[PDB]
Amino acid sequence: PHAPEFAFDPTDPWTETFQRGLEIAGLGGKRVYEVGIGTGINVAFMLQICEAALVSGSDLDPRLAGLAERNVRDLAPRRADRFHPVEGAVSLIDTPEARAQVGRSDVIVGCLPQVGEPDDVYPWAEFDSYPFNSVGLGLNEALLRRTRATAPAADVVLNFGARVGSAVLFELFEANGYVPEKLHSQIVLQHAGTDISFFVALENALAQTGLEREFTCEFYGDPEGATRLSATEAQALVDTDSAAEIYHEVCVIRGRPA
Amino acid sequence: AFDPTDPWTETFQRGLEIAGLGGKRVYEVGIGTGINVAFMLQICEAALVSGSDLDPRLAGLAERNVRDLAPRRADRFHPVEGAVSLIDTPEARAQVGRSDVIVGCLPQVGEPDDVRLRAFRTAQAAALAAGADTRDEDHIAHYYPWAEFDSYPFNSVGLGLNEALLRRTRATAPAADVVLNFGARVGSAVLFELFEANGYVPEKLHSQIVLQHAGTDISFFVALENALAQTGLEREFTCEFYGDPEGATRLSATEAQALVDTDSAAEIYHEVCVIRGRPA
Amino acid sequence: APEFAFDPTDPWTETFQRGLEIAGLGGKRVYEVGIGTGINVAFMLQICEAALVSGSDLDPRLAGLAERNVRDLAPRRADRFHPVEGAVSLIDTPEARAQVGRSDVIVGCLPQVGEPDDVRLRAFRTAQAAALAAGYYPWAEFDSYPFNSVGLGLNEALLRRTRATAPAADVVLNFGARVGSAVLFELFEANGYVPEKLHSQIVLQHAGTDISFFVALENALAQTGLEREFTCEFYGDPEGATRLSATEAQALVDTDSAAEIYHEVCVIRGRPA
């Protein structure tokens, strides 16, 4: 009954949105696998604040597993005995060990590369064929094919920019064997350098049939998400003013198998 | 007996009879006013029928409707309330998971151009028969969306919504049959691949030659005939139309549109068929 | 297993057969999609020591010609070969599904973009000849597959069938690797299979081979309409020391004609979880 505000990072609104969803997910007592553990701070968060029973994970970069280990031992010293990462270079979960560990997990979590992520920030062309790569989420769909096969009973909890709308995000789960549920969302502001052509091209794109398409992306003018904008609209306000403040939603969605 | 003004629905119903729904639990996606619910209950002798529609005002009407249509069996009709897109609600999924068979005539490119007008007139006919004098808008609606089904592989032949329902059925009812109605202009091979690609063995249960209204646009199907493949290599493809009500003289989409570029009332036919998908 | 057994006339089939031997089919019950004239059946019974080989073909005449070829080439094993009859597209008959569902391993060298340009004329001449004795896959229904974007749509269509009909069976497939192994592996990972590359060779491509489809791959913009980095894998030498894009390969030949262009063929096994 006391929100752990001190815990969520004050720096990155994407990671903050993720961590708040992880807290809501209810990871207490579960085995959890994180795709792309990075520096390990999410693992530390899930161990210390969420109270996961066990956490494993992997990264594409082999040096990151070892560095994640220090961090977890520094930041969650009295819970670090429960962090068992998988070394070494692991794209998605594509090694036998990563597969074994995913196979034993109750929840798979991640914030994966996706069109629309922040610039500041996997191999990439082999995911181009995925149907949901048409909205920039191929890599995310690639993981859902793997999780459904290796751990068919586990939840999958993923972080998304929601410029394409929640009907599409929910579709990515429904198309792949999972009932989706939005755990948490937030309005976030994007850098002034962010490119969004991709998003204007989306609403200007003919279907695929192809016939029609009066669809519109989701942006906001205020940090409260009061004033909706299309991608074209938004793209305008920046042609008007290069330092115009543009907002979109980031949200955490859990897919639960049947 | 069947209404011959709506051949897609005749086709649908005739297909359902053949399905073998005697004593089974069935879910219908898009129950409408319950015409198909009552049919299965009265003619097919189903033990239980449930289902939903994306218009939330419809279940109530249907219920009523089925009561009047099959009162001696309307107690086995158990609709699910709410604005149910496909089977997207816990309660909807729950019922689907308990069903032996899932049936639908779903939106799809090539459905009759007047399908949304017929539904509006059927909704308002059913409310008048229930003793209510209403506002017309009570029977209109903004359903079904389309953008989230656009990325589906089989949306390229206009069946994205149908594919999406198959992703759903397979996961929440992996042993259930799925019985679906389609316009076959794209070819029965393509219709069969829709099922095969999604874990189902297809069987064509019944089919019929029907005529398309004169003002029906078929440039979509023409556009498929001139398209290249995903490869960018030449694609060989032909749509299936007919010049005769019997389905004896075949026409591609390009030919069919020629006969209405020269004349303007040339009778143009195509197939409508019921396909059952059965999992292994 | 002796060198003489592997096909000395055809690098694609030689690659397939070296890969099947490495798959360890001994004692297994196997199913081949596209048996053709049955030589691979003979190779799997006689060299791989399979307990039982079934399979089918789209051309309904080939199962009968494959029986005679297996009777004449592995007479001591011929009783272990039980082809499925009739025209069979992939495995799409109740008898082919029933056999596939009893199989330990499903194998195939399936039609695919990048196959040798003369394979369809071979199969045609090969029919006719073998047809005495005495007396193709369309590609339109498979065009929707995501992996058709790389020309592997028929292969993906099989993976959807095997997974449903024989969920515990391995699946062993021969591929040209011009689109790279990450893509080939992703075809399996996307469809419920863990890929392992069993064997691979560097083959020479016929002289007038059209590689325009692969050039186009290197210049396409993805599904998102933005940039994409991608090079097909070709080689200038028969050991693959010197790499080449499809564009480099095409250019090497625009200025020659008889330039030697090489690429990889490789056998991948897809194992369920």
PDB file of N, CA and C in Angstrom, chain C residues 55-98:
ATOM      1  N   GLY C  55       6.136 -41.782 -48.270  1.00  0.00           N
ATOM      2  CA  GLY C  55       6.219 -40.491 -48.923  1.00  0.00           C
ATOM      3  C   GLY C  55       5.241 -40.393 -50.076  1.00  0.00           C
ATOM      4  N   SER C  56       5.346 -39.284 -50.805  1.00  0.00           N
ATOM      5  CA  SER C  56       4.365 -38.985 -51.838  1.00  0.00           C
ATOM      6  C   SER C  56       4.933 -37.945 -52.785  1.00  0.00           C
ATOM      7  N   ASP C  57       4.177 -37.682 -53.842  1.00  0.00           N
ATOM      8  CA  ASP C  57       4.594 -36.731 -54.847  1.00  0.00           C
ATOM      9  C   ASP C  57       3.345 -36.104 -55.446  1.00  0.00           C
ATOM     10  N   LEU C  58       3.519 -34.950 -56.097  1.00  0.00           N
ATOM     11  CA  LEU C  58       2.382 -34.291 -56.748  1.00  0.00           C
ATOM     12  C   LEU C  58       2.014 -34.996 -58.049  1.00  0.00           C
ATOM     13  N   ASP C  59       3.013 -35.350 -58.844  1.00  0.00           N
ATOM     14  CA  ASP C  59       2.820 -36.172 -60.035  1.00  0.00           C
ATOM     15  C   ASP C  59       2.409 -37.588 -59.636  1.00  0.00           C
ATOM     16  N   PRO C  60       1.209 -38.015 -59.928  1.00  0.00           N
ATOM     17  CA  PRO C  60       0.736 -39.307 -59.484  1.00  0.00           C
ATOM     18  C   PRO C  60       1.358 -40.533 -60.094  1.00  0.00           C
ATOM     19  N   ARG C  61       2.226 -40.339 -61.043  1.00  0.00           N
ATOM     20  CA  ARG C  61       2.895 -41.424 -61.664  1.00  0.00           C
ATOM     21  C   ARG C  61       4.173 -41.777 -60.984  1.00  0.00           C
ATOM     22  N   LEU C  62       4.696 -40.894 -60.185  1.00  0.00           N
ATOM     23  CA  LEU C  62       6.060 -41.054 -59.699  1.00  0.00           C
ATOM     24  C   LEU C  62       6.179 -42.105 -58.598  1.00  0.00           C
ATOM     25  N   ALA C  63       5.149 -42.274 -57.763  1.00  0.00           N
ATOM     26  CA  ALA C  63       5.216 -43.285 -56.708  1.00  0.00           C
ATOM     27  C   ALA C  63       5.407 -44.685 -57.290  1.00  0.00           C
ATOM     28  N   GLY C  64       4.759 -44.967 -58.421  1.00  0.00           N
ATOM     29  CA  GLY C  64       4.924 -46.263 -59.058  1.00  0.00           C
ATOM     30  C   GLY C  64       6.288 -46.420 -59.696  1.00  0.00           C
ATOM     31  N   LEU C  65       6.819 -45.338 -60.267  1.00  0.00           N
ATOM     32  CA  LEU C  65       8.166 -45.406 -60.825  1.00  0.00           C
ATOM     33  C   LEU C  65       9.218 -45.444 -59.722  1.00  0.00           C
ATOM     34  N   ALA C  66       8.930 -44.815 -58.581  1.00  0.00           N
ATOM     35  CA  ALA C  66       9.838 -44.885 -57.448  1.00  0.00           C
ATOM     36  C   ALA C  66       9.892 -46.291 -56.863  1.00  0.00           C
ATOM     37  N   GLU C  67       8.780 -47.025 -56.892  1.00  0.00           N
ATOM     38  CA  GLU C  67       8.803 -48.394 -56.396  1.00  0.00           C
ATOM     39  C   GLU C  67       9.753 -49.251 -57.220  1.00  0.00           C
ATOM     40  N   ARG C  68       9.652 -49.168 -58.551  1.00  0.00           N
ATOM     41  CA  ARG C  68      10.527 -49.972 -59.398  1.00  0.00           C
ATOM     42  C   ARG C  68      11.986 -49.592 -59.202  1.00  0.00           C
ATOM     43  N   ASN C  69      12.280 -48.292 -59.122  1.00  0.00           N
ATOM     44  CA  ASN C  69      13.653 -47.866 -58.865  1.00  0.00           C
ATOM     45  C   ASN C  69      14.157 -48.367 -57.508  1.00  0.00           C
ATOM     46  N   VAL C  70      13.287 -48.446 -56.503  1.00  0.00           N
ATOM     47  CA  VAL C  70      13.748 -48.920 -55.205  1.00  0.00           C
ATOM     48  C   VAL C  70      13.883 -50.433 -55.224  1.00  0.00           C
ATOM     49  N   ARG C  71      12.983 -51.109 -55.949  1.00  0.00           N
ATOM     50  CA  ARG C  71      13.092 -52.553 -56.128  1.00  0.00           C
ATOM     51  C   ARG C  71      14.407 -52.927 -56.808  1.00  0.00           C
ATOM     52  N   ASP C  72      14.853 -52.120 -57.770  1.00  0.00           N
ATOM     53  CA  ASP C  72      16.060 -52.402 -58.535  1.00  0.00           C
ATOM     54  C   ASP C  72      17.342 -51.906 -57.878  1.00  0.00           C
ATOM     55  N   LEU C  73      17.260 -50.953 -56.946  1.00  0.00           N
ATOM     56  CA  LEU C  73      18.451 -50.336 -56.374  1.00  0.00           C
ATOM     57  C   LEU C  73      18.710 -50.715 -54.927  1.00  0.00           C
ATOM     58  N   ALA C  74      17.676 -51.069 -54.167  1.00  0.00           N
ATOM     59  CA  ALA C  74      17.835 -51.591 -52.808  1.00  0.00           C
ATOM     60  C   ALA C  74      16.900 -52.778 -52.653  1.00  0.00           C
ATOM     61  N   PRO C  75      17.168 -53.874 -53.381  1.00  0.00           N
ATOM     62  CA  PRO C  75      16.234 -55.012 -53.368  1.00  0.00           C
ATOM     63  C   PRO C  75      16.069 -55.629 -51.997  1.00  0.00           C
ATOM     64  N   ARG C  76      17.110 -55.584 -51.147  1.00  0.00           N
ATOM     65  CA  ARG C  76      17.016 -56.181 -49.817  1.00  0.00           C
ATOM     66  C   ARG C  76      16.227 -55.313 -48.849  1.00  0.00           C
ATOM     67  N   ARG C  77      15.998 -54.040 -49.190  1.00  0.00           N
ATOM     68  CA  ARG C  77      15.232 -53.131 -48.350  1.00  0.00           C
ATOM     69  C   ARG C  77      13.883 -52.773 -48.947  1.00  0.00           C
ATOM     70  N   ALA C  78      13.590 -53.228 -50.171  1.00  0.00           N
ATOM     71  CA  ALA C  78      12.431 -52.712 -50.899  1.00  0.00           C
ATOM     72  C   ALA C  78      11.134 -52.923 -50.128  1.00  0.00           C
ATOM     73  N   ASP C  79      11.050 -53.986 -49.329  1.00  0.00           N
ATOM     74  CA  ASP C  79       9.862 -54.251 -48.525  1.00  0.00           C
ATOM     75  C   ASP C  79       9.613 -53.185 -47.462  1.00  0.00           C
ATOM     76  N   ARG C  80      10.591 -52.329 -47.166  1.00  0.00           N
ATOM     77  CA  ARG C  80      10.434 -51.287 -46.156  1.00  0.00           C
ATOM     78  C   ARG C  80       9.859 -49.987 -46.714  1.00  0.00           C
ATOM     79  N   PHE C  81       9.597 -49.915 -48.020  1.00  0.00           N
ATOM     80  CA  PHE C  81       9.161 -48.701 -48.697  1.00  0.00           C
ATOM     81  C   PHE C  81       7.677 -48.812 -49.010  1.00  0.00           C
ATOM     82  N   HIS C  82       6.883 -47.907 -48.444  1.00  0.00           N
ATOM     83  CA  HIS C  82       5.429 -47.911 -48.605  1.00  0.00           C
ATOM     84  C   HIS C  82       4.962 -46.530 -49.044  1.00  0.00           C
ATOM     85  N   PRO C  83       5.161 -46.178 -50.314  1.00  0.00           N
ATOM     86  CA  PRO C  83       4.709 -44.859 -50.792  1.00  0.00           C
ATOM     87  C   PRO C  83       3.206 -44.688 -50.626  1.00  0.00           C
ATOM     88  N   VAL C  84       2.780 -43.450 -50.551  1.00  0.00           N
ATOM     89  CA  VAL C  84       1.395 -43.091 -50.539  1.00  0.00           C
ATOM     90  C   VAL C  84       1.062 -42.813 -51.994  1.00  0.00           C
ATOM     91  N   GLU C  85      -0.068 -43.287 -52.468  1.00  0.00           N
ATOM     92  CA  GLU C  85      -0.447 -43.085 -53.854  1.00  0.00           C
ATOM     93  C   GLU C  85      -1.294 -41.900 -54.207  1.00  0.00           C
ATOM     94  N   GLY C  86      -1.244 -41.536 -55.460  1.00  0.00           N
ATOM     95  CA  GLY C  86      -2.025 -40.451 -55.965  1.00  0.00           C
ATOM     96  C   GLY C  86      -1.345 -39.143 -56.034  1.00  0.00           C
ATOM     97  N   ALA C  87      -2.024 -38.147 -56.541  1.00  0.00           N
ATOM     98  CA  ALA C  87      -1.464 -36.803 -56.557  1.00  0.00           C
ATOM     99  C   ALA C  87      -1.538 -36.236 -55.144  1.00  0.00           C
ATOM    100  N   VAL C  88      -0.387 -35.918 -54.564  1.00  0.00           N
ATOM    101  CA  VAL C  88      -0.325 -35.418 -53.202  1.00  0.00           C
ATOM    102  C   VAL C  88       0.399 -34.084 -53.248  1.00  0.00           C
ATOM    103  N   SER C  89      -0.324 -33.012 -52.951  1.00  0.00           N
ATOM    104  CA  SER C  89       0.279 -31.704 -52.776  1.00  0.00           C
ATOM    105  C   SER C  89       0.706 -31.616 -51.322  1.00  0.00           C
ATOM    106  N   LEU C  90       2.005 -31.420 -51.099  1.00  0.00           N
ATOM    107  CA  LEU C  90       2.594 -31.476 -49.765  1.00  0.00           C
ATOM    108  C   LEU C  90       2.137 -32.795 -49.145  1.00  0.00           C
ATOM    109  N   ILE C  91       1.348 -32.754 -48.065  1.00  0.00           N
ATOM    110  CA  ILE C  91       0.828 -33.986 -47.466  1.00  0.00           C
ATOM    111  C   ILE C  91      -0.697 -34.006 -47.405  1.00  0.00           C
ATOM    112  N   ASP C  92      -1.342 -33.361 -48.363  1.00  0.00           N
ATOM    113  CA  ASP C  92      -2.743 -32.973 -48.200  1.00  0.00           C
ATOM    114  C   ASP C  92      -3.750 -34.048 -48.636  1.00  0.00           C
ATOM    115  N   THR C  93      -3.561 -35.291 -48.209  1.00  0.00           N
ATOM    116  CA  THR C  93      -4.597 -36.309 -48.308  1.00  0.00           C
ATOM    117  C   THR C  93      -4.675 -37.018 -46.970  1.00  0.00           C
ATOM    118  N   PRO C  94      -5.828 -37.603 -46.636  1.00  0.00           N
ATOM    119  CA  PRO C  94      -5.917 -38.334 -45.360  1.00  0.00           C
ATOM    120  C   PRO C  94      -4.894 -39.454 -45.235  1.00  0.00           C
ATOM    121  N   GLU C  95      -4.513 -40.105 -46.339  1.00  0.00           N
ATOM    122  CA  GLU C  95      -3.525 -41.177 -46.239  1.00  0.00           C
ATOM    123  C   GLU C  95      -2.132 -40.614 -46.010  1.00  0.00           C
ATOM    124  N   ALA C  96      -1.803 -39.496 -46.662  1.00  0.00           N
ATOM    125  CA  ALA C  96      -0.495 -38.885 -46.436  1.00  0.00           C
ATOM    126  C   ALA C  96      -0.392 -38.290 -45.030  1.00  0.00           C
ATOM    127  N   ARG C  97      -1.462 -37.659 -44.545  1.00  0.00           N
ATOM    128  CA  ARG C  97      -1.482 -37.171 -43.168  1.00  0.00           C
ATOM    129  C   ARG C  97      -1.360 -38.312 -42.169  1.00  0.00           C
ATOM    130  N   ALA C  98      -2.030 -39.435 -42.436  1.00  0.00           N
ATOM    131  CA  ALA C  98      -1.967 -40.556 -41.501  1.00  0.00           C
ATOM    132  C   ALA C  98      -0.561 -41.131 -41.431  1.00  0.00           C
TER     133      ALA C  98
END
